[PDB]
């Protein structure tokens, strides 16, 4: 299926004592591969996935210098955004930044990203056209013009449409045994009594990868998309994912309902009943 590479940056200010805690993580699809942490002992770009360890020291030295560059850019962004919004210095604040690119099944560019947030609220984001920005409040309009005067979006289109796609293709090829696998979900279903005149049926899906899965209930034979509960896909702790879906069924009619699982690791979508 489609693939993506995302880089996440977070610098939280420790008011008074303590320099800003800076964390930088790189992702391919759902798994992290690189990580930097100010509180870590290495002070370098540490590996987090097996396949990137093919890269030599020239890679790790160049990436480490670039992370420490982003560490200072965001250390100034904290002071710049604290003064624009006119805020106290005894209070902590959080700047977040994400840029990356998506590709389809044919590994061709789909869309790129370059977004920013202050304390978890959308600050400025690169639009779909990779040209204009999305600024809501005036402190983001100040940054919008500042990035328009410096031609930021024009300088990033080279990275988003090319450099990002090239490295993602190398990552998908060096780690094809990890990033291109499809573990089929091991499925089962349970029936627990909720009360009289009703009872629930929980459709499970375990030990699958990637996290993209579709679990819909069907009551002979239409979807019950409204009155159904669907937990967020969660990590199992061993690289796979878990998810379930449940419906409340009046007693004696559990056999009329049926669950349907759709996943990349399944040649045809499965179907289970009581």
């Amino acid at each position: 299926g489609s693939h993506s590479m995302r880089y996440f940056f977070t610098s939280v200010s420790r008011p008074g004592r303590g320099e800003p805690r800076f964390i930088a993580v790189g992702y391919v699809d759902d798994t992290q591969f690189v990580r930097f942490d100010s509180d870590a002992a290495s002070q370098r770009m540490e590996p987090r996935a097996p396949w990137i360890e093919q890269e030599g020291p020239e890679y790790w030295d160049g990436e480490t210098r670039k992370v420490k560059a982003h560490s200072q850019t965001h250390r100034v962004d904290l002071g710049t955004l604290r003064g624009c919004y006119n805020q106290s210095e005894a209070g902590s604040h959080t700047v977040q930044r994400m840029y990356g690119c998506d590709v389809g099944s044919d590994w061709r560019f789909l869309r790129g990203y370059h977004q920013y947030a202050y304390d978890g609220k959308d600050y400025i984001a690169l639009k779909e056209d990779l040209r204009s920005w999305t600024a809501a409040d005036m402190c983001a309009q100040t940054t919008k013009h500042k990035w328009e005067a410096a031609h930021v979006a024009e300088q990033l289109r080279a990275y988003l449409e090319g450099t990002c796609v090239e490295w993602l293709r190398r990552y998908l090829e060096n780690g094809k045994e990890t990033l291109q696998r499809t573990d089929a979900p091991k499925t089962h279903m349970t029936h627990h009594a909720v009360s009289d005149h009703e009872a629930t049926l929980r459709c499970w899906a375990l030990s699958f990868y990637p996290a993209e899965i579709t679990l819909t209930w069907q009551r002979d034979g239409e979807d019950q998309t409204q009155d159904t509960e669907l937990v967020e896909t969660r990590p199992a702790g061993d690289g796979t994912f878990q998810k379930w879906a449940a419906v409340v069924v009046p007693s004696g009619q559990e056999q009329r309902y049926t669950c349907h699982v759709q996943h990349e690791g399944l040649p045809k979508p499965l179907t289970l009943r009581w």
Binding site: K66, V67, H70, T73, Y171
Partner: peptide, 9 residues
């Protein structure tokens, strides 16, 4: 892989 030229706010 990482973006070299990052711009401040």
């Amino acid at each position: 892989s990482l973006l070299m030229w990052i711009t401040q706010v």
